[PDB]
Ligand binder design. Structure first.
Ligand code: M5X
Ligand code: M5X
Lengths: 304, 304
């Protein structure tokens, strides 16, 4: 009973967090095996950030200029290299707390947990979605760069995000663990446009299935629709178009509840066209889109 | 930038989770030093739960009947005892991952993180508030009993909650770590009334301060009010009455934003009397009450 915006247990990621200092700049790093990963803008002063030439700035740096501290012990840097927007600092000791892990590039609409860190120390954990426009609506202050996003499958941590930027619009931008930004963002303190964001339709429907499973049924109606009819309403309300792939992923939830995916689409169409009328669904007064169909099944079945 | 319902990093608590089996019943336990804490209803069959005589049921049990497994290793039980609604199973080995800890009984309106577990394994972490009526609106399935709520102050974990019950209304009930239930609940599968719940006024105001800090200012008005006038509106909308103690706790937030607490009360009064008019505050379409004044300061300053 109950449905919550749940993050993964963060323990395996906490044991990987280190502090990285270069000159006067400090941010977070991720220590896996004998490599520490961090945003390359650790080599910049706030002055350099307006238009940085990263290749030129890194050339002024040597292994001894990167101070890596794990808790209270110092790591010895024996190599440094830039890969896209991350620096990989080779250390002489493998992290004894390195969990089984993968680096993955998530798709927009997919979710992950963020372990917000400051000075190498974890402050908190929350669940995010990578927006269709490749931004994240996180909680990041100065010094949070290097904090990572991840998913956990039994004992394997798939790292998917590293925080780099707080855009002037208040949204957050970052890279995968190979240093490639999600979206058109660059690691430069300049005005950068995030595209028009849309609501993740498959996640809203998955969340409506979670509401039915937990008792919130008031929104269910006597109507059905077609993918084409629904997509006309989706277009009007800036929802991602629903595809047969999305319908297929909702299969298990449709099977467990006995509610056809297109009947749930008609309930969503009525909610979009008429609002909530002052009511709530799972304690929320808007349509939640940060739970994937996989999150709902996992939470509703109790997968550990 | 950004404000999220953030949970504490759960690592220190993950290292304390064990599985406890007694007969055919399995739930979670908390291993701290050489003691494993779990709900006493682990000794019941679902049949016993309708009207259990715990003293009589425990007498049929011996140390060898309690199977405690931490990950994959077995703990040797050398003592058992019931304290209120918890069982304390003395084990022969102190948990090497026991963090610095305290047992605390939280007040209603205060918040904490829950590490939802099944069969001794962590599945997720989320932030809760202890409702004014002493229930929690969590996410708990069968097998989640023994999962704990906690707060962390630097390196000290203060355990405040242990999950015991899923009430027929879909809300959750549990105890502190001494086994005393929060509220009038008993560990019996019977119809139990949760009192009338109220909204935690001081937390809503603290959340309104968090919205001002992050840019959401539309709700601010040209009005002020008095504690007596505000409490008349609070009464009408089932909000907890605001006291000078609550105003005092909002002091630091009032100082950082330059918005007098009673001016923020008048904005809240207007939101209560007029609704949101289809707008949002911090991505929410209702008034959030699960952030204390301490949570807001901690998140907005980046305390680790
Ligand atoms: C990031 O939060 C950090 O730790 N340091 C830093 C410096 C500059 C930016 S910004 N203004 O977004 O370019 C972000 C971070
Ligand atoms: C609790 O979730 C658990 O793990 N086992 C158990 C048994 C009975 C209840 S109930 N129906 O709430 O009394 C809760 C739990």
């Amino acid at each position: 009973s109950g449905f919550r915006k749940m993050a993964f247990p963060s323990g395996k990621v906490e044991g990987c967090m280190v502090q990285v200092t270069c000159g006067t700049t400090t941010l977070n790093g991720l220590w896996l095996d004998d490599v520490v990963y961090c945003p390359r803008h650790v080599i910049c002063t706030s002055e350099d950030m307006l238009n940085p030439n990263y290749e030129d700035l890194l050339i002024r740096k040597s292994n001894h200029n990167f101070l890596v501290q794990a808790g209270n012990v110092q790591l010895r840097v024996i190599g440094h290299s830039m890969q896209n927007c991350v620096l990989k600092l080779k250390v002489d000791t493998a992290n004894p707390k390195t969990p089984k892990y993968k680096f993955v590039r998530i798709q927009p609409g997919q979710t992950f947990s963020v372990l917000a860190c400051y000075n190498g120390s974890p402050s908190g954990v929350y669940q995010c979605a990578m927006r269709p426009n490749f931004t994240i609506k996180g909680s990041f202050l100065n010094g949070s760069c290097g904090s990572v996003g991840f998913n956990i499958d039994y004992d394997c941590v798939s790292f998917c995000y590293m925080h780099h930027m707080e855009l002037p619009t208040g949204v957050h931008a970052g890279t995968d663990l190979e240093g490639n930004f999600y979206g058109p963002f660059v690691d430069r303190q300049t005005a950068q446009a995030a595209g028009t964001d849309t609501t993740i339709t498959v996640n809203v429907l998955a969340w409506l299935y979670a509401a039915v499973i937990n008792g919130d049924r008031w929104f269910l109606n006597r109507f059905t629709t077609t993918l084409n009819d629904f997509n006309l309403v989706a277009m009007k309300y800036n929802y991602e178009p629903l595809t047969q792939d999305h319908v297929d992923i909702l299969g298990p939830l449709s099977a467990q509840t006995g509610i056809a995916v297109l009947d749930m689409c008609a309930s969503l169409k009525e909610l979009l066209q008429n609002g909530m009328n002052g009511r709530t669904i799972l304690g929320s007064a808007l349509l939640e889109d940060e739970f994937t169909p996989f999150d709902v099944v996992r939470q509703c079945s109790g997968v550990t």
